[PDB]
Design a binder for this molecule. Structure first.
Ligand SMILES: [Cl-]
Length: 809
């Protein structure tokens, strides 16, 4: 994925002349001319001279423009075309980062079109994302990529030598990776004077970026929109006469308190300007959930009562998107071939985000159901109607309880304004917001930056792999530095994962974990899934921890669902293996045909949509492992990586590799039916098992130890998903080993509180094996290749076989 980077930037006079002549021919080309007239309508085009002069005269510049300004497709072109016009065309190598893969591809393909060229193929414009590229010509070129690709590039060339201009787009989004890239770039530019840096924001709050970069020049590009009418939840209900089918810590609590206090009076005044039935329906509305039936009813109204145009729907996540898609397709209206209904979500297959293609006649109407990714520059043609569900998925991090969650939260005003602007690019539009007027007045101006709300482990490994020095020091230099407590927790988890040594340097395991673009506990799990040849069930479990588990509890069926779930557990005493068995049973049912598949899901109360998403994530995980050289195939099911996939002990040991140090000691029950099942933890004292767990009532445990992933605190701490494991799993994959005796007995302690009976020689064996495993992983840093398990005698097989023999007890 580094091929463009490794190219050397070498200006050429002959190429300068040739490109200047290429421009002359383009000026006469009907195709090019037609495209130029489209461009001239964009506000960016009109100030092109001042943008290029600012960039040419200053090393760092900040560009702000709102929706429709055209910065993302235009500014790269302005630089290249200015160089070409000046007879310096070959001196340009322009790289522009995008927040998502689909944006990189879509923008690059659109710019190629506007230049009357195909994308890649040695032409002026192309893209690079992980494992897929259309690369432009070496000199006088534009490359769209992701932030991830730049971070990868910095491992190979930390100077970004051959780049003349780096354009960081959509910076207002404040993604973790953008913030770090920004600090890295700031350090580089001070050292190398020939790099131009251009920072682009879609919102007008960009002064902070200018200050960060030393109060560098700023410039504004006007947005472009036709007028868009906005509707609140009151207006929508009133307009369509909606008939229902039925009937993130302290500063959120503050805002809800204010909402609650202003609620009665808001409602009271609302009865002044709206029908009584509207207010009563609005009053019944659930704030926690987007109402998908309302969205269906609104789409129905638009189609029947309003003018032609495409409809864009914004929903928090995959669950909502697939649910609304099924809901629409279950109505004979939308079954027609005059509707095209397209899901858009970032974790579906690559150009399975299919929404770019020229839509076929407008006798057929496009309905795009998308996440917040449709807010960015993406080609969706002819949108007259935007339905804003009002929510966005956000990660939050409770550092006092060490709990990280993903939830749907209210959009900011900036989000809402971007969604509004999507309806006004073609003709006068309509944007329907599913929040009420009181909610609107209480939205935040902007979202809190990710760096403040997110676990830092993945970022910390990036810092180390890029040799940026001390972790806490670097993080303190970011534009918004994270809290000390988030930093201390992050560094601690990485040491307990054995990713960092006590001196905060990468271990060989850590090097490999840094090469996997997932959280390190997931990375460690899938890595040992690869090394131990468990791949398929381990990837299932990993996907399940990353998104969520497939089970649902329908009303009235609670007791029945719990029994079916425990049935799926069999004797494993594992929530994680329960998901494996569910998943395998589902796949087997799928082969027999869709009746059997739906049947299986109703029998075990499984979400088909969740299962499908888990399956897609598995493929991704395998791709990451293939690129890191730990598997030879992109198939989770590849026979050679699955020889151990039926072995319960081996899979359990891999789950333990991933989830340590989240470890609990069982408090023995002693046939007391009046006492809840509880467990001891290092950090939290005695806690409870969640009722959803297959172990919640278990009296029969074969070992004394659990590992868990999800912890929640309501009136007290509950463990959501846990797996019984043998002490040998903790012994190999856990913390420091110590030996103690007490007379007769040989004792081993792991991280000092995990204490069990075991011969002293086992402790020495394990210390030996850990070091041999380090050396194995060390050798693969420079020469990554999958372990060949068909060659015994190989000494990699010897070491890994010995580890497997140990954790089989
Ligand atoms: Cl059933």
């Amino acid at each position: 994925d580094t091929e463009y980077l490794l190219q050397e930037n070498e200006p050429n006079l002959s190429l300068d002349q040739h490109l200047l002549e290429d421009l002359q021919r383009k000026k006469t080309d009907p195709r090019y001319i037609e495209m130029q007239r489209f461009r001239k309508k964009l506000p960016s085009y009109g100030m092109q001279k001042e943008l290029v002069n600012l960039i040419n005269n200053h090393q760092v510049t900040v560009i702000s423009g709102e929706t429709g300004c055209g910065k993302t497709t235009q500014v790269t072109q302005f630089i290249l075309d200015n160089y070409i016009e000046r007879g310096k065309g070959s001196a340009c190598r322009i790289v522009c980062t995008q927040p998502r893969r689909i944006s990189a591809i879509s923008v690059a393909e659109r710019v190629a079109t506007e230049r009357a060229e195909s994308c890649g193929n040695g032409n002026s414009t192309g893209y690079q994302i992980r494992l897929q590229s259309r690369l432009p010509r070496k000199q006088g070129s534009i490359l769209y990529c992701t932030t991830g690709i730049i971070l990868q590039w910095l491992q190979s060339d930390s100077r970004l030598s051959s780049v003349s201009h780096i354009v960081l787009d959509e910076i207002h989004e404040r993604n973790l990776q953008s913030d770090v890239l920004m600090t890295v770039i700031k350090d580089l530019l001070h050292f190398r004077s020939d790099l131009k840096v251009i920072l682009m924001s879609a919102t007008l709050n960009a002064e902070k970026f200018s200050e960060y970069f030393g109060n560098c020049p700023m410039i504004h590009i006007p947005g472009f929109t036709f007028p868009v009418v906005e509707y609140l939840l009151e207006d929508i209900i009133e307009k369509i006469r909606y008939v229902p089918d039925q009937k993130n810590r302290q500063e959120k609590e503050e805002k809800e308190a204010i909402y609650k206090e202003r609620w009665p009076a808001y409602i009271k005044e609302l009865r002044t300007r709206y029908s009584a039935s509207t207010v009563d329906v609005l009053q019944m509305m659930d704030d926690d959930k987007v109402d998908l039936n309302l969205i269906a009813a609104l789409i129905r109204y638009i189609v029947l009562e309003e003018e032609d145009g495409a409809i864009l729907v914004f929903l928090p996540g995959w669950d909502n998107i697939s649910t609304l898609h099924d809901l629409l397709m279950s109505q004979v209206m939308f079954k027609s071939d005059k509707f095209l209904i397209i899901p858009l979500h970032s974790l579906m297959p690559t150009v399975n985000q299919t929404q770019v293609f020229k839509k076929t006649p407008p006798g057929v109407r496009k309905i795009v159901i998308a996440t917040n990714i449709a807010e960015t520059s993406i080609t969706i043609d002819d949108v007259v109607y935007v339905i804003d569900g009002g929510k966005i998925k956000e990660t939050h991090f409770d550092t006092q309880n060490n709990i990280s969650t993903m939830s749907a939260e209210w959009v900011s005003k900036a989000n809402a304004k971007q969604r509004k602007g999507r309806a006004g690019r073609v003709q006068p539009g309509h944007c329907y917001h599913l929040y009420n007027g009181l909610r609107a007045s209480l939205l935040d101006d902007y979202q809190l930056p990710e760096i403040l709300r997110t676990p830092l482990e993945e970022l910390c490994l990036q810092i180390k792999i890029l040799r940026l020095g001390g972790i806490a020091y670097f993080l303190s230099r970011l534009m918004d530095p994270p809290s000390n407590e988030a930093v201390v927790l992050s560094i601690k988890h990485l040491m307990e994962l054995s990713a960092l040594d006590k001196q905060e340097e990468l271990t060989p395991l850590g090097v490999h974990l840094a090469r996997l673009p997932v959280e390190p506990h997931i990375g460690k799990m899938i890595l040992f899934g690869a090394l131990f040849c468990c791949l398929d069930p381990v990837l299932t479990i990993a996907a399940s921890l990353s998104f969520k588990d497939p089970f649902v509890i329908p009303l009235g069926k609670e007791k029945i669902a719990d029994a079916r779930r425990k049935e799926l557990a069999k004797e494993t005493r594992s929530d994680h293996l329960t998901v494996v068995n569910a998943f395998e049973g589902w796949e087997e049912a799928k082969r027999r045909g869709f009746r059997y598949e739906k049947d299986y899901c109703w029998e075990y109360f499984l979400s088909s949509n969740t299962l499908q998403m888990l399956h897609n994530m598995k493929g991704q995980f395998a791709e990451h492992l293939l690129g890191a050289g730990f598997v030879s195939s992109r198939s989770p099911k590849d026979p050679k990586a699955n020889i151990n996939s039926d072995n319960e002990k081996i899979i359990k040991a891999v789950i333990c590799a991933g989830l340590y140090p989240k470890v609990a000691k069982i408090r023995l029950n002693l046939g007391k039916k009046r006492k809840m099942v509880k467990v001891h933890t290092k950090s939290d004292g005695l806690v409870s098992i969640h009722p959803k767990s297959v172990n919640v009532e278990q009296t029969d445990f074969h070992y004394n130890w659990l590992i868990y992933h999800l912890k929640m605190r309501t009136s007290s701490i509950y463990l959501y998903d846990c797996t019984e494991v043998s002490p040998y799993c903790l012994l190999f994959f856990g913390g420091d080993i110590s030996i103690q005796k007490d007379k007769d007995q040989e004792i081993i302690a792991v991280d000092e509180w995990i204490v069990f009976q075991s011969p002293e020689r086992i402790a020495h064996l394990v210390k030996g094996l850990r070091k041999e495993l380090d050396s194995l992983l060390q050798e693969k840093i420079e020469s990554p290749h999958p372990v060949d398990w068909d060659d015994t005698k190989s000494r990699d097989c010897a070491v890994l076989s010995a580890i497997l023999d140990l954790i089989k007890t």
